[PDB]
DNA sequence: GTCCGATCAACTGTAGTTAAGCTGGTAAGAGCCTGACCGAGTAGTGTAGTGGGTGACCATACGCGAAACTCAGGTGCTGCAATCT
């Protein structure tokens, strides 16, 4: 209580190690369900009114120990990765439908969304940064998933060991949905992973977002 | 250590005891070589035990391949509805 921050308003166990990610689904119809994910790989939702009587099991992930997590409040879904290199969502109503939104060749490291519209903005740890429409997903049918679902990559950095140069490439690239994809782990240079990614969320700056990588290089785009 | 000089016998003048080997027929020393009898010597042997290394068989390990099982791709009609007519 931040009016009252001498003593919690309860201190429960609800996972073996390190909790990485705590996120609110908050809705004008139901409950406020929080979510969490740690290194022992459990995503677990649940209603703070009472833990042990609510609490739920969305997967059991490899231990990960980056694993980004955000609501999309536009269509009710929690978006995450899996600790390796998928993009999933998963209702809060509904743990059981959780579906894949896009596949990547290194992690998903950061991920994020706006509270005026249903874009997903994701990057890997291979510097690649990709953005995809995740109500196309959750509000249509199961059917043509594996083609009327689709991803763009709107920017990649790429590094020369010997050149030294960060090397920014503008050039879009379609990549459709693989459903029965591997994981995979491309390893890559150090500077180039992306460390944030957020939208502006206000309606004059709604089409304007910003990312990051690990060596400094901060980047804005007003998309028009 | 040495000094005097008495004194058994050293080294000095002639008067009287010792072998060697002849005639032999002979038994006496000193002896030789084969043989036998036990003690000791040369030395490989007779049980008996400690250690080691070889051989067989196993299972444990990874790593590549083989088939298993789960979960979701894909086929094709047609019940039902909507575009063109």
Redesign the pocket.
Same mark, same amino acid.
């Given at each position: 209580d931040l009016t009252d921050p001498e003593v919690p308003s309860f201190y429960d166990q609800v996972h073996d190690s390190y909790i990485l990610s705590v996120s609110t689904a908050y809705s004008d119809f139901e409950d406020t369900v929080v979510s969490t994910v740690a290194v022992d790989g459990y995503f677990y939702i649940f209603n703070p009114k009472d833990i042990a009587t609510t609490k739920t099991t969305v997967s059991r992930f490899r231990g990960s120990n980056l694993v980004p997590v955000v609501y999309c409040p536009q269509i009710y879904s929690y978006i995450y990765s899996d600790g390796a290199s998928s993009l999933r969502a998963v209702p809060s109503r509904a743990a059981f439908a959780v579906h894949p939104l896009v596949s990547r060749e290194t992690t998903i490291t950061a991920i994020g969304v706006s509270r005026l519209h249903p874009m997903v903005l994701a990057g890997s740890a291979d510097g690649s940064l990709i953005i995809t429409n995740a109500a196309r997903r959750l509000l249509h049918g199961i059917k043509n $998933? $594996?083609a009327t679902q689709k991803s763009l990559r709107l920017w990649k950095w790429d590094y020369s060991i010997k050149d030294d140069k960060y090397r920014i490439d503008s050039s879009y690239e379609v990549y459709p949905l693989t459903?029965?994809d591997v994981s995979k782990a491309k390893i890559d240079a150090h500077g180039i992973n992306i460390t944030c990614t957020k939208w502006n969320e206000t309606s004059a700056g709604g089409k304007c977002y910003a990312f990051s990588n690990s060596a400094g290089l901060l980047t804005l785009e007003y998309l028009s």
């Open positions: $998933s $594996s459903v029965n």
